[PDB]
Amino acid sequence: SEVAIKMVVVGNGAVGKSSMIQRYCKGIFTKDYKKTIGVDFLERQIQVNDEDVRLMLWDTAGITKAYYRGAQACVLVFSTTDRESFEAVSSWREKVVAEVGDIPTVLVQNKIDLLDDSCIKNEEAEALAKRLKLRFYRTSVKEDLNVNEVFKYLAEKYLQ
Ligand SMILES: Nc1nc2c(ncn2[C@@H]2O[C@H](COP(=O)(O)OP(=O)(O)NP(=O)(O)O)[C@@H](O)[C@H]2O)c(=O)[nH]1
Ligand SMILES: [Mg+2]
């Protein structure tokens, strides 16, 4: 037997959800932006506590019922250069809780490589994560920076 975990990745359009999943599961950086059509399924096998676990990442455009059904962990994503995507974070957390209840969740500020054009103050983001009682990562899918740690953390939080 091998444990599988269904993970959803949610957040406003263009924050980098598909890119994060394609980086994590296939090791590529998708530079072109196309809004995701339908639901896409990707997976990666990782070892947590020396046991192989299969992460099943569900990707859709930022359907509702089937997408969230059986979700076991969640990545909440906003973008360093998209203020509206940050201001919607609380609303996304309420939406996941309403649909699947209390599951392991992590908060991610993506595109941290564009920090020269940031519209989110470091204290603002860290405060939001504290209020929502969520661990917080700053990632760059483009630079493969902290992407692996986001998903390993969720897998450890689910298995423990
Ligand atoms: N500079 C930079 N661009 C990024 C990063 N991650 C993703 N992008 C870019 O952001 C754009 C949108 O990314 P995408 O993964 O499609 O976003 P999405 O959240 O899946 N959008 P949708 O909800 O419409 O499907 C793409 O041009 C992609 O290359 C990052 O870390 N840095
Ligand atoms: Mg997408």
Q: Give residue limits of the domains in the chain.
A: 3-159
DSSP labels, 100-119: H-S--EEEEEE-GGGGGG--
Q: Among candidates 112, 118, 119, 123, which has minimal Cα distance to 145?
A: 112
Resolution value in angstroms? 1.8
Q: Which ligand 1 atom sits nearest the alpha carbon of residue 60?
A: 25
Torsion angles phi and psi, residue 44, rounded to 5: -145, 135
According to the CATH classification, is domain 3-159 in 3.40.50.300?
Answer: yes
**Residue 16 among known ligand-binding residues:** yes
CA of 14 to the centre of ligand 2 (A): 7
Query: Is any ligand 1 atom within 6 A of the Cβ of residue 41?
Result: no
Interaxial angle between packed helices 17-26 and 147-159, expressed in degrees from 0 to 180 and rounded to the nearest 10:
80
Burial class of 33 by CB neighbour count within 10 A (0 to 12, 13 to 18, 19+): exposed
Element (H, E) at 60: strand 51-60
CA of 25 to the centre of ligand 2 (A): 14
Technique used by the depositors: X-ray
Cα separation values, 97 from 73, 88, 145, Å: 11, 15, 28
Place of tokens 């998708």: 30
Q: How far apart are CA 61 and CA 40, in angstroms?
A: 10
